[model samples]
Target: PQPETLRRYRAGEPPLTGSLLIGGAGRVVEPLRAALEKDYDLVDSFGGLVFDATGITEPAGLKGLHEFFTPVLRNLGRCGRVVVVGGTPEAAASTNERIAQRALEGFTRSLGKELRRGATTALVYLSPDAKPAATGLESTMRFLLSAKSAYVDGQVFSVGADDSTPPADWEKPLDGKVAIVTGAARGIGATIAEVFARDGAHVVAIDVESAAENLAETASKVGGTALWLDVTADDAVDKISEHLRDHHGGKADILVNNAGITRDKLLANMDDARWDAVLAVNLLAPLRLTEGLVGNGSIGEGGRVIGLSSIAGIAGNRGQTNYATTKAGMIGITQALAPGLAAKGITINAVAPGFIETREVGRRLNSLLQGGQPVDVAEAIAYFASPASNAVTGNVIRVCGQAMIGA
Candidate 1:
């Protein structure tokens, strides 16, 4: 019936074609009266919206059925094919099309769900783009009346396209980031590299010659290269520099020092090789390699050095004097490098694991953590590696979940 009236209905008391709103509230009604007198068939002396004063109209709901529509709703003539001749900034602002427009989802969804018989309602989001000059409303009118939006309701959609299109690789802000991870051959390093790769960084995974298979596996999955060399060796630093020059374009944007070994022994029961190897692999190697890389111009300009420290260093363990020293030395690296590397746009830091729940680590810190996972450590490393994290140099960001160990 509503559709039939709109297509075939004639003029009203004064007769009307469509509803056109100018301004609202305490403003100028004289200019409005003058415009209607000169152009429209009949002018209103009362009422709020478009043609309601003409005494010819139809409204989805009366002035305000729920009384919640405090500003008052407009009533149109037999204008089933309602054409809004544009809108006013203030009136449009109050038209529920701005500010709180999102609420229209439920309100109009109800209309689509509850409208009986031949009734239909539509809300067209015209971005001032549908028009060429003032003719934009015409384009909007053509679509709102068409069958395209037959049953659509309660959905928010953005159809306006920007003038320019971004590059395909520009989707993520981290697309250009670089993250280098060592000891990546089938351990925590491998997992970290894969995670960094998924987060849109170019990963660099390195390991010893014995872990070649593990390195290859991680490299393939994480979209990174694998370096098969012993990080403990004195030449490791030079080789890393060469690797960076060849593959990384001579930049160690993010350096993760995760290459280390464990040698557990009591202070009195320790042998020379056990103590020396632990210090060489864990503590001395990081110092030597960092010194070498810094000297060779490997890490500079937005660079990050992340060492893998451990909880054993924080809360002294029973049979791990050698391992503990290396872990504690990690913090020393952060303090030592902070001053020197700061001059070259670099930051050195560390992650000291408390009770990491890995199958190999045996849940030592499980009870202490509320629920710390391995991914928690990776995320912390990423936060320090983030571009906006400039003030975080030398500071060890703890992922320890409030561990009460030192007391």
Candidate 2:
């Protein structure tokens, strides 16, 4: 896997000019082309190109595309980039489009499988009028087109400029912000903590007493604030608020309510205390913590509150009634306080991880390999914490690589 791991290559690397397979050659090509000329080489230092397929359509593209890409895929050696930019969802229907998209997926996944050294493939759809207001899309595309987004392989992106209006400061988005993540001792919480810190925000790590050693170690690794917070406390709100007010001057840019637990059992055979424990830790604690912040104004203007939701909340699982209910309640709390929270320039949202790894939880699940690493969950939280994600308020962003069911 070391040989197959995709990575950002060096300046003097192989295949200086990455290929761009363009299907929808409308105005959608302009900004990306412009971006190629402006922000690309200066950054990736690699030349970029677009194969305009405007007049060519899907009728006779199969042979030509494959022929053109044969050596590109084979001899494109060491470090290279590939972009599949289709015009619209309509393109997914065309025989050529279907073949290309399927081929692209196979090619990328294979590349990832056999992708030794460092290489990447990106598939995307760009709407015609999406030229100007390409905020997050811009960042995402920039990442895809260059070697920067190497690890983000086997993924498809949609860059729609029109639907999403861009933010004012496009680059260097997160600045002088603070995010406090609970359960930062490991797993999803560490991911949440690490990502926020990586994006230039102060990350505070919270965990159980048993996690003191590991949590402190993790905190030091990311320059984060490590506090032993048991959100289940009756005084959790007061304690958190007081800490922020005193040390942080009463301002935390983001609060990632990622702390949670899992108590699996059959309802009929379940004990009342077990159910109560799940409710107390998962639901009630986070609510009390947020309410505490709200009352004390600990989370300042443009603040963010993100809860960790689960697919179980949408598609209930066996013997997880308590867990599912707590997860379900997450949305209600987020939406209920959205209006009031947004008025104070705060956004409340949730990131429901589909199937994440058990590394943070200390092992892997025997059931599925599709489950993600802790870092995967962390990256999503970082996005919500980022200034680039300011417009995305009250959204339930699934950190689950496109999980089947969503609530």
Candidate 3:
């Protein structure tokens, strides 16, 4: 079942119905508290808990985390948020500091599994020399505390410094921007188009000929255009480039490589045909398209490239060798292209979904003990696609309800 707070949020209400509680006595606490007060209500009782562990420099300091959360854990409201903020382990001042900082990960991850009634927990690591205000921490905090991240749980975020400007209107961050989403005919892709349009982007939805009708419907519903092209085709990139130039403008601001296919088979029974088919559609197509679009200057400065990965890719699954290979390859593509893309004022990231219900399903082993909706995956993609995440790149966030299977 879904949480009431999430339903209220979907209906345009505030992210939290109850007041938020701040914990910890660290450098990040005051600034984070000030930033949150402008948009959220703060009180003694908990609707959400944000702990600032950035000042924990010794192993004994770790006990502060227990003192902060142990008492309030039972008081969090339905769909509540818990965020632990800390300095990156690599940026620690000493060996003991690094060890303590690294310990927060295990603490938060285990805590996520212990919480119930839709409460979610996550940890955020801020790079040294980056102020909380300058690093896009507020934006990341907003997403973590909001219903937009309903299916995202037990994740860790690394925020650095970027020169990108914040959007004039946070509600419409993508206003006047051009976005392209592949395999957007239905399920997660269609929902992505809707979310992007809601955030004020001009969407170009793409799918294959077989799904043309659904694609057109999604496009029309979002007031965007639909392109019926098999992503594995030779001229797919060229066609996408031409469409962007002729329709939206000469450049694109976001490109979501959501198009993908699955050919499941165990390694023992896997055939070349099944493997090749999955590889061509899921991995090769994104590789070729990104290269063409970036090379030809279609996706230019400040652009975003989001790839769809899977939990199966991260933990591996029976009867999914071929599918997992391509999905894992998505993470590879993201990391490999990040430096070059960042130099061009662009970012590349991936969202690994677990047990998302899209006429598709799974059960248990996650913090939520439930399957996520398509919009859950879409919202993570939206985060990666936004200018607010300008400092985030080459990251693969699993919107998996904090599934126990993956790291």
Candidate 4:
């Protein structure tokens, strides 16, 4: 997990350049190639794979699947990425085409599982029309191809049409935006606030009044506003809305529901207080705040709402029914609100993180993603908060280092 080389690269020295190998061709391939070349050093062959299977229309077209990977088996470097682009089944011209395109899902998922040495794989499907000019092609491709997506693997993404324009300065894409992050006194929330500020957003860091000093210190360090209030308070959403209006003169462009608590007790051993407290802070708070903000027009058009879920939500944990319930509810709330918010130009998504190195137990997890830093989750949060994900809604990206347990 230690990459001394990438650390220096991010510190403004020369970047470590490597070859990117792309396969097949069609309308989607060119733009994807252009996006990949922007970050990587392209080569004729012998690098990583971005198989453009959009042109495949039959079982015979998948013949190269075995042939293509067999040679690159040993040549693939550590921390490499492999992405396959395909047309959706509904977009296929014929039954054969649909079968071939649909097969990419299984292929990519299985590839991610077996592609060792920290390499990750993903499958991206285009809209039904199979248009290369689809909205999220550029940004989605950029993310999947970059080192920022190191923890995302064995996932599938579908891109739809969005007309949002790209930012003039890609380096600081969130410049001149307002973002509110809960639980920002420390941990993942603190890293999230710092990353957002680094990306040019004016951050409002919120935490409990008990942590006011820590929160204020973080706010000062990040050059953001500090709000000492409990998220579960009844007037939290409205009060935050009023503050945004009074101080910033506009709604927040980003909201991160990173505040959560855990009272781990088996069902038989659990008390009412533990259950209620966990549910209120972890689930109900984000749910009400999200709906209230959006309904009251406090979340702007093209806005982003990112909630924190957990791998326990997907795989189920033995001693954390209450915690799991809230985490799983976040996924439901994200999907439920997506359709309505998409109409108003807002996107809601969640990240299910596993075994972050915030504590000792995090290192005990038996997975490729063990010992991950808080910034890893923050990077995923950044992806969801960016305008680059305009067409990405109702999705949950796991920042778990592709752990073996969960979906």
Candidate 5:
């Protein structure tokens, strides 16, 4: 599977150039083409592609689509990209149109499976009102096209209605924004804080007093603020709520719930304390903080809420009954809140990481055949935090290097 895993490239690495823009009904291709051309050297069909399947209304349309892609299908570059844009099936006007739009899902997912060499494909479902806002889709498209999304594959994303516009500078999308990250003393939380700060956001690093020293160091290094708060405390939540409203204009542009704990014990052996403690820190805290922030209007337009779920949450792990339940609960919470958040111009998403290499003692049990870095999870969080992901909500991306065994 090593040879089959998608090849990924990044900022300091060599760039993948050239792209082909085909199909689509009208000016819909304009924004994506512009985005691709800015990042890649070209948008010519000879390279990667942005295929608009908007006009297809039946199975017969696929034949023409096939012929159009045959020329570049095999020629796509190894760190290449493929995006199929379509109208949302639920938003379609007629039965035939809805079925055709739904068919795009099968086509794109199949393409991802058959496509090799780290090249990946994803389906983008756009609402009628969302088509003109290319900026909404721009960042997500670029993320999928770049090395940052190496582990992400075979996923379907929607670009629903979002009134938030793009940033003046695409390079620094988080510019002038404020971000709050929980458990930011070290490891992935610290890294997420650092990345948000580097991207021009003012990071508020939060953690327990036990990690105050390291948390202060991290905040100082990033030129951000450090606050010690017990996430499980109702009083803490109220205090932070007031603190944020007063200091940061009543809202945080990005909220990362990265603070979590693991109490790995079988359900039968798991004591009540272990279960309660894990759930208190991992699931309930995030849910409480998120609800507090949202209810107070502390997460304003274009704001993002990212929860840290684990791969174990996706595929249950042994001796992790409590831990997995909390992780999986993170996903459930994200799903429940996304629609309402979108209405508020806020997006909610989660990152399910697998076998991160913060320690050296972990035994190898992964599909990518290796553990990931803290930075890997941080990068995914950064994506969710960016303005480029305006239309991206209710999605979960794995930072596990395509671990074949997990959900």
Candidate 6:
């Protein structure tokens, strides 16, 4: 696979290689178009298609989707994007509206499978009270359309009524923010530190004492500090809290629970040691760290807590009972903690990566027909940690290139 999408992102090229086509009916359409026009080109022959389906109230309204896409689907540029914006089904006033709105998920997911040449599709649901102009719609649109979201396919994102301001500079959205990424010694975690640093965040890279050398190198490369602390240690929470207070002005704006270990084994052969170790590092540590940080005011208002889940969590894998349990628990944490976190102006979300190149063979199963790069997962984390995702919480987005096996 060429990974043209990743190339564009690495080169810092424009978000869209060609112009975009805006179509659909709703109060949101014009405002969304206006917002996008400020940063992207709008034209008849588009590389991207954005449709606002919030106005659809009946099953019959779905025909408009076919009419809009059928004519243009074949012409979409390589590595193109298609986003369908709809009203939240639960917030719909009528049964017919809810039915119609809920149907958009199937439509977009199917489109993702049908599209070729790395083209991808996603759905964004806006709460009834969400304002397209003032809410996080623009930010969501930018991410969905950009190469940064190359491996994020067939996912559904919900935007609530929470208000958010756009970053002063799109390239440096994390400017002045302090981010702590656990498991930052290598692979996905290391790339995440690099991406956050490039986005202007002050990164606190944390890893186990065993990987202290690599951790120090990553921290130094990113011009951030490194902490050699085991996440599963009994005093892990206290050490993290003290470190943030002592080093980063007593607060951390973002926390990424990327520290995870896989003790893969069939349930029939799995032992206490395997299950316990995986759960300790992957699930329990994140829970303890997040609670400690939030309770002690180390991660204050506007803080972002991101969990690194896996596709095995969404779609169970054979001989991975221990690993899957922990990954799935990550999603459980995101959903359960979101409401409480939101009360304090904090947001919680998870990214379930699928067949990333760090380890794969199962690589060719996705719609993209290839495994993802570490940067792909890091990009998704950056979005979750940024101000742009204020209205997006309690969501588990899969950076999976629309893998066929998982929901």
Q: Which regions in candidate 5 have their CA more than 4 angstroms from the true location?
A: 1-27, 44-47, 242-247, 359-371
lDDT of 5 by residue, 1-407 (tens): 45443344344553444455544554357666665565565543233567777777776676655866677776786656777888778888788879888888778766766665656677877776674646677767666666666655556777765544667765566899999999999989998887787778999899998999999999999888899989999786677777687778777888999999887888888799999999999999999999888888788777899999988899988999898899999999989999888788888999998777773333244333457777768877887888878778888877765455565
Q: Is candidate 2 or candidate 4 better by lDDT?
A: 4
Off by over 4 Å in 3: 1-8, 359-361
lDDT of 2 by residue, 253-280 (tens): 8888888898899998899889999999
> What lDDT tens digits, residue by residue, belong to model 6 across residues 28-133?
8888878878678886346799998998999999999999999988789888899999998999999999999999998999888888778899999988887657
Model 4 TM-score? 0.90
Query: lDDT tens string, model 1, 324-368?
Result: 878888988887888788788776778776555553343322222
Best by TM-score: 6
User: Which residue window of length 10 is worst by lDDT in model 6?
Assistant: 1-10
- List runs of model 4 lying over 4 Å from the truth: 1-16, 36-39, 44-47, 89-99, 359-369
lDDT of 4: 0.79
TM-score of each: 0.56, 0.66, 0.95, 0.90, 0.86, 0.97
> lDDT of all the models against the reference?
0.53, 0.61, 0.85, 0.79, 0.76, 0.89
What C-alpha lDDT, on a 0 to 100 scale, does residue 402 get in candidate 3? 86
Better of 4 and 6 by TM-score: 6
Which of the predicted structures, 1 or 6, would earn the higher TM-score when compared with the native?
A: 6
Best by lDDT: 6
Worst window of 10 by summed lDDT in candidate 4: 5-14
Cα deviation at 162, candidate 2, in Å, is 11
Per-prediction count of colliding residue pairs?
A: 3, 3, 0, 0, 4, 0
Candidate 2 wrong stretches, greater than 4 Å = 1-37, 41-131, 136-175, 359-369, 402-407
User: Residue 309 in model 2: shift from native, Å?
Assistant: 1.2
Q: Per-residue alpha-carbon lDDT of model 4 for 218-337, expressed as tens digits? A: 999999999888789888987898889886885899999999999999999999999999999999999998988888888968889999998999989998999999999999998999
Flag clash pairs in model 3: none
For residues 361-391, could you state the per-residue lDDT of candidate 3 as single tens digits? 3556678878788888888888888887888
Q: Rank the candidates by lDDT, best first.
A: 6, 3, 4, 5, 2, 1
